[PDB]
Design a protein around this ligand. Structure first.
Ligand code: HEC
Ligand code: HEC
Ligand code: HEC
Ligand code: HEC
Ligand code: HEC
Ligand code: HEC
Ligand code: HEC
Ligand code: HEC
Ligand code: HEC
Ligand code: HEC
Ligand code: HEC
Ligand code: HEC
Ligand code: HEC
Ligand code: HEC
Ligand SMILES: [Ca+2]
Ligand SMILES: [Ca+2]
Lengths: 520, 520, 259
């Protein structure tokens, strides 16, 4: 049984915590729920930590008083098909392997499944750790609660004796690095300096051995990623997001200065040895658009190359942890502003960006976003109970599972079937354009070896490579983005038509150049 | 409240209407239900119209006394997936973009959905009006009743100030022309001369500005397309069909002179200034095979080219509005008889036909057609009511939704699951052959650039182009035709095997010619 | 196929119908839909009917243009349990027999079922006609559409040769009388004087032989009970109601003079 500690004693040294804790809705929640600080209190001074207190980061620390939210979070949506590869004819990107050739995603890229699995899925995907980590057996893939209890309760490491990234199976990659983990867990929140920069007080950083870092991490999507444990108020903890919104002053809604001001973020910095160490972003309001944008964004979390000179940009560089915080039509400019690209296409040699799940940036400017709707309205609605205390569902899943609460409450003119039909109209239309964009990209890509072998000049190949960048960007955004156009159908339409235009331009350029070589 | 007019006064000048109206089941239906003729009657002479009476073409004009039929017609089948592109791996024609390259359908070709949407879908498809028309917002896509009330109640025009066909978005085409509208609406039935020929009394014709014509049209599938408003008797109004069956004497069942005689059509012509202007085809019987053949047929409704000399055949030519009225094995001959093809393939340069939904011509000679079954038996059956006045369902949709009334009433030996399994056997088999036909067509198409670049002779390329015509015809008929072989499975099988044979012949020809060039 | 008649000619004598028909939403609906008046027009004067025109009272006369309303009306609710006696422990009035002893309802009083059956149920109930009328067989009890087509298409009379109310089975009663029928049909609307008073022009009245009257009646709940066929406007036709509301001045809402 827990025994309370005297928080006044802590507050003597922890003024920032005092100011948060005493004012919020956790003012009566004793520190012992999450911290074991006995030896810390015996040894600390006002500027030196002394013995490190233990801080609980398990979600059960919150589930004791918030079982409803915890249970809704950990529910596994069995209809979210697991380990479903996107590069197949029946999934999101039928020609993905040809289009992404040269990139680590060619090894495996599955559709997302329920949040409980995020950390385990990150660890076991074929592109991440060379196949080092596996579930203990193939039955464990169902065990959401187990994954939440801790990744290492359900996973095995092929070689606990080594800590290097290497292939354990031939068709795997070792793309994982420490930045990835920031969107899977915040178990490292006290051990990682802001942005993963080198820091005396940080156990882990962008340049750490990711296998060793992995072994230290257990829990997915900690509840405190969106809720300050001290004030219980809304926040974000993701460094990349704070950096974009606050440090770079882009604001929470870069396209709406007024909304950015009303629904803003306040950066709170915590120090170690009186030197800035870590930060959180306190939100003005409980704005799930910004909470979900901690992870559902396009980002860099990887080494890459400079657009200017093609030189390597390694994990040690700040750019290896970066939120572009730019919609699809501002993205090329945002990548130019940091002088960065992700990979060279294996066939065309083009410098290309790699886009990932840009839901937050896609949502900006959509009809729903403009009308003050937020992710949670459709994906974590309040529960409707005939007789019950209302709480917010933490199931984070498609509104198809709860259309009454997620759509039909606003769309009184529709039945569930009508609303589903509206969704399907958009997704079907968008998917048709994605498929057409891929057809044209693939047609362009296939001409590169023919052009090279026909003696087409490097100048013409480079012209086509520049078009490839744009054709790729304006296509890939939409296979990366999870709503298949729903979050912003007009933007998807304009973008995908732009992709096709670019590819058609490249096809015509290469075809003409090949024919001119043949004629000469 | 409507006030009746004295029809005897009209009949003094309108003898044809008198002869139809006084004899049929609308003999007691007063003209005021559909015509406002007060100023007309004040100003007309026996040969000069004077002020033009207003004629209601809205479906509500009939819904007042026939609500059951109207309601069954306007029902939206939400299971008929909307805006679902056919050129995707999960739809009807996975390799459609490669195979149709050079044709406007490459811009967008979706599966059909419920009839209520036909006119709006025609207006908004990407291949039709350059993206000029859109639904007012993405919610309106569900609104069948709204579309029926009028296209312009649910659509917007990007530029009401101009009337030219142009692209408003890059990846669109402007394939629409006035002939298309004849299979979407007959709001223009009093404003369009037979076949769309130029006529002093016709506001619109094949050569009209289609954007201006579009703006004048509102209602889909008017009830009077199949039912004469004066006699209430069965008819067709579609000029192309009347022209094939009656003018060209092909008959309602070209393969069965006896059935053509028993279930025939009588052309009734109406004049303006004592000159033939428009026509209808009165049917001997209420034969839905011929009613549905007003639209569910292969047709020309577009400019094209002559097979003989390759010269352009424009909208001004009669051939731009043409029902081939020929099954797949008679089609090449029917296209030769008018010296016509649709497009040149973008890759192979072959002159090719473009086939569209030839359900009527495919149905001929099938077991069901031979046994006197008609479209309505499977797609608009009589309602079965424990206690009720029976009426004919106007829902026009797959029999899967009403298997009791559409199949099982004739097929007493089967359960619903057995009947569905029989359908699926045919569709699965046919689809497998469609996919194989496409594989071979694509393999042939891919050899054309290789052959051209290897120096293969024009004589050999032209030989392969002639094979392409046939390979394409005997494949495309079946992606165009909506039943995936069900309407005539033996014919689909023979045709698709013919396609593959033709493609294989072309592949062998080109491969050999390429190898001979390489060896020399 | 119906052939329209000259309604203006009718109106030369039928001013009341003119004032209703020409103004309402049936102004375009020709008389031939509901009346066969050819011989009537040949023989009538404004003061002498001549040949009595035939008036259709069948609901099909309306169903032709109003199929949706007709079909919703005729649907049988199979969940409305049929012939369910109220005087049982599981129904509405477990002690009904004791309490109602001395009244004809003691012989049978079932729960209501769908409107399509009202006239046939009236005819076959044990308390009404001594058991004289039965469904043609026990299968016909399902046939709502049949009952609507006409009671005598689905019922049999045990003795077509007599017209007296008598028992045909021991535990029946003969409570039916002509007034009952006013809440089952209005096929007699042109043959019954207001309230069922004796009248030279009334074939039927309160004192008629109910068995003879019964045989003349076919259709349940005629559509025109609530809708005037001439104006299409809302109405009632039930004499007892008009008498209460108008003649006795009680009004449509006796507890609310404004309403
Ligand atoms: C019991 C000892 C608790 C533990 C452990 C945690 N929380 Fe809590 N929380 C608690 C109470 C009594 C309340 C106030 C309830 C009220 O509405 O009066 C809360 C409140 C929250 C809220 C809402 C805050 C707001 O400003 O609206 C959140 C988001 C919340 N708590 C989250 C949370 C998390 C993430 C925890 C684990 C770190 C957690 N709580 C622990 C009681 C208790
Ligand atoms: C980083 C810590 C994340 C935050 C914050 C949010 N999401 Fe997320 N989401 C994340 C991952 C890594 C995954 C895939 C997990 C896996 O194992 O595959 C997801 C998944 C979703 C899904 C799909 C769920 C399913 O049933 O398939 C949805 C609908 C989703 N995420 C929505 C969402 C919303 C609305 C958020 C703010 C409340 C949110 N997520 C936060 C990573 C993270
Ligand atoms: C936050 C900005 C993220 C970083 C950095 C990484 N991931 Fe992620 N991941 C994120 C979200 C919001 C989702 C769900 C949405 C989606 O489109 O997938 C994911 C999902 C995964 C998955 C499951 C799906 C799949 O791709 O197979 C895996 C295996 C995964 N993520 C691994 C991964 C690795 C190896 C990373 C560093 C290279 C990485 N993620 C970074 C959010 C973020
Ligand atoms: C961001 C991705 C979230 C994570 C991780 C968690 N929660 Fe949450 N929570 C979130 C939102 C957007 C809201 C609603 C805010 C609003 O006012 O609209 C909530 C709400 C809570 C509450 C308040 C009571 C309620 O509304 O249900 C509690 C107690 C709460 N959440 C607890 C909770 C716990 C225990 C979590 C880990 C399992 C957890 N939250 C994760 C967003 C996010
Ligand atoms: C309602 C107006 C929505 C808002 C606001 C947000 N999203 Fe959404 N999302 C919506 C729909 C209708 C769909 C398609 C779901 C389907 O079943 O067809 C989506 C999809 C997602 C997904 C993929 C979910 C899955 O396929 O299982 C993710 C990860 C997702 N959305 C996340 C997301 C975030 C982070 C949002 C705020 C920025 C957001 N969505 C807004 C409906 C709505
Ligand atoms: C009421 C004033 C009507 C209007 C307006 C329309 N129709 Fe009609 N129709 C009406 C009647 C009374 C009948 C006869 C019913 C019977 O079976 O006796 C009809 C009949 C039809 C039929 C059946 C004809 C046949 O020969 O079997 C059709 C196909 C029909 N009506 C169609 C129709 C259409 C398309 C209308 C709008 C142009 C329309 N009707 C108007 C009454 C009325
Ligand atoms: C031209 C005026 C048509 C006539 C006459 C018929 N049909 Fe039709 N049909 C037509 C179009 C333009 C469409 C597609 C509409 C759209 O917006 O996409 C259709 C569609 C059908 C379908 C598919 C319906 C669905 O649920 O997807 C069926 C089954 C169908 N048509 C059958 C059919 C029959 C049996 C007809 C004679 C009674 C008939 N149609 C007439 C155009 C026209
Ligand atoms: C009658 C002989 C037709 C002419 C002329 C045109 N269309 Fe049509 N259309 C017709 C039918 C029977 C159907 C449904 C069956 C099917 O296979 O689609 C259609 C359907 C459409 C659709 C919806 C499906 C799609 O292709 O995306 C559209 C957008 C459409 N039709 C447009 C169109 C245009 C632009 C035309 C002139 C070039 C045209 N149609 C002519 C029948 C007939
Ligand atoms: C051809 C594509 C049709 C269109 C457009 C409309 N109807 Fe129709 N109708 C059609 C058929 C094949 C039939 C049955 C013929 C047969 O005897 O088997 C019908 C029937 C009618 C009837 C008769 C009563 C009945 O059988 O239900 C009516 C009153 C009728 N149809 C009305 C109607 C209206 C109001 C329409 C526009 C909404 C309409 N029809 C369109 C074929 C076609
Ligand atoms: C029963 C013997 C049929 C007759 C006669 C006609 N069709 Fe048909 N059709 C039939 C089946 C079993 C199917 C496949 C439906 C499925 O769900 O698998 C079809 C398909 C159509 C379609 C496409 C419908 C859709 O996919 O939603 C159309 C447009 C169609 N059929 C039209 C049509 C016409 C015009 C006919 C007379 C010439 C006709 N069909 C005859 C069954 C039967
Ligand atoms: C069915 C739709 C009808 C049409 C059209 C017309 N009439 Fe009618 N009429 C109808 C019924 C069912 C009855 C019985 C009485 C009732 O109120 O329901 C009648 C009655 C008459 C009478 C008798 C009135 C009386 O004195 O008791 C007359 C003189 C009469 N109806 C004339 C008439 C004329 C001239 C019509 C065409 C303009 C006509 N009716 C239409 C049903 C219907
Ligand atoms: C077709 C020849 C009809 C016959 C026979 C009957 N009715 Fe009718 N009715 C008809 C029309 C064209 C209209 C007007 C439709 C509109 O809204 O414009 C009507 C109207 C009615 C109404 C509504 C009247 C109102 O709102 O004021 C009712 C209640 C009605 N009709 C009833 C009715 C009955 C009971 C009939 C049998 C005696 C009947 N109608 C015959 C067309 C036709
Ligand atoms: C006299 C002509 C009636 C008028 C006018 C209405 N109702 Fe009636 N109703 C009547 C009878 C004789 C019966 C029983 C029929 C039988 O065969 O048993 C009924 C029955 C009902 C019921 C029960 C239906 C069921 O499913 O069991 C209801 C709910 C009902 N009646 C309601 C009702 C309403 C709302 C009316 C005005 C629109 C109405 N009735 C008129 C006799 C008559
Ligand atoms: C209108 C004021 C009515 C008169 C006069 C009669 N009945 Fe009736 N009946 C009426 C209604 C509204 C209902 C349904 C509601 C209910 O409580 O039953 C009925 C029902 C019947 C039934 C079926 C139920 C039953 O009692 O078995 C029968 C057999 C029946 N009515 C017969 C009947 C007889 C014999 C009448 C004259 C003595 C009689 N009804 C008068 C409305 C009215
Ligand atoms: Ca990226
Ligand atoms: Ca064609």
């Amino acid at each position: 049984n827990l025994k309370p500690v005297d928080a006044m004693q802590c507050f003597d040294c922890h003024t920032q915590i005092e100011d948060m804790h005493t004012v919020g809705k956790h003012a009566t929640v004793n520190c012992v729920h999450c911290h074991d600080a006995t030896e810390h209190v015996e040894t600390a001074s006002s500027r030196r930590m002394g013995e490190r207190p233990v801080t609980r980061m398990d979600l059960e620390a919150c589930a004791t008083c918030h079982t409803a939210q915890f249970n809704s979070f950990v529910e596994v949506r069995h209809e979210s098909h697991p380990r479903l590869e996107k590069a197949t004819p029946t999934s999101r990107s039928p020609m993905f392997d040809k289009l992404i050739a040269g990139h680590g995603f060619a090894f495996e890229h599955a559709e997302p499944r329920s949040h409980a699995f995020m950390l385990v899925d990150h660890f076991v995907v074929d592109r991440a750790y060379g196949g080092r980590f596996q579930f203990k057996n193939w039955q464990k893939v169902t065990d959401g609660m187990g994954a939440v209890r801790g990744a290492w309760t359900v996973l095995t490491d092929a070689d606990p004796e080594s800590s290097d990234q290497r292939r354990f199976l031939s068709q795997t990659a070792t793309a994982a690095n420490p930045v990835c983990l920031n969107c899977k867990t915040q178990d490292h929140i006290l051990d990682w300096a802001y942005m993963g920069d080198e820091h005396e007080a940080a156990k882990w950083s962008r340049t750490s051995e990711v296998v060793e870092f992995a072994r230290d991490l257990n829990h997915p999507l900690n509840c405190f990623m969106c809720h300050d444990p001290h004030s219980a108020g809304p926040r974000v903890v993701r460094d990349g997001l704070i950096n974009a919104v606050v440090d770079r002053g882009l604001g929470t809604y870069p396209h709406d200065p007024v909304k950015s001001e009303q629904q803003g973020m306040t950066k709170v910095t915590f120090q170690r040895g009186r030197e800035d160490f870590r930060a959180i972003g306190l939100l003005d309001t409980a704005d799930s658009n910004v909470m979900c944008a901690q992870c559902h964004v396009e980002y860099n979390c990887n080494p890459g190359y400079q657009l200017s000179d093609g030189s390597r940009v390694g994990m040690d560089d700040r750019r290896a942890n970066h939120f572009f915080w730019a919609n699809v039509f501002d993205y090329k400019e945002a990548a130019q502003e940091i002088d960065f690209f992700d990979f060279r296409h294996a066939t065309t040699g083009a410098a290309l960006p790699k886009l990932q799940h840009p839901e937050a940036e896609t949502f900006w400017g959509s009809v729903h976003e403009r009308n003050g709707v937020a992710c949670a309205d459709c994906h974590m609605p309040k529960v409707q109970l005939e007789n019950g205390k209302v709480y917010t569902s933490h199931s984070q899943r498609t509104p198809r599972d709860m259309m009454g609460q997620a759509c039909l409450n606003c769309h009184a003119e529709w039945t569930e079937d009508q609303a589903l039909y509206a969704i399907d109209y958009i997704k079907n239309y968008t998917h048709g354009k994605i498929v057409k964009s891929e057809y044209w990209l693939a047609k362009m890509i296939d001409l590169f070896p023919v052009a090279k072998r026909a003696g087409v000049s490097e100048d013409v190949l480079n012209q086509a490579r520049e078009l490839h960048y744009d054709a790729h960007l304006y296509w890939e955004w939409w296979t990366a983005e999870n709503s298949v156009g729903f979050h912003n159908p007009d933007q998807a339409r304009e973008s995908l038509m732009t992709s096709i235009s670019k590819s058609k331009e490249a096809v015509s350029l290469l075809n003409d150049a090949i024919d001119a070589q043949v004629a000469s």
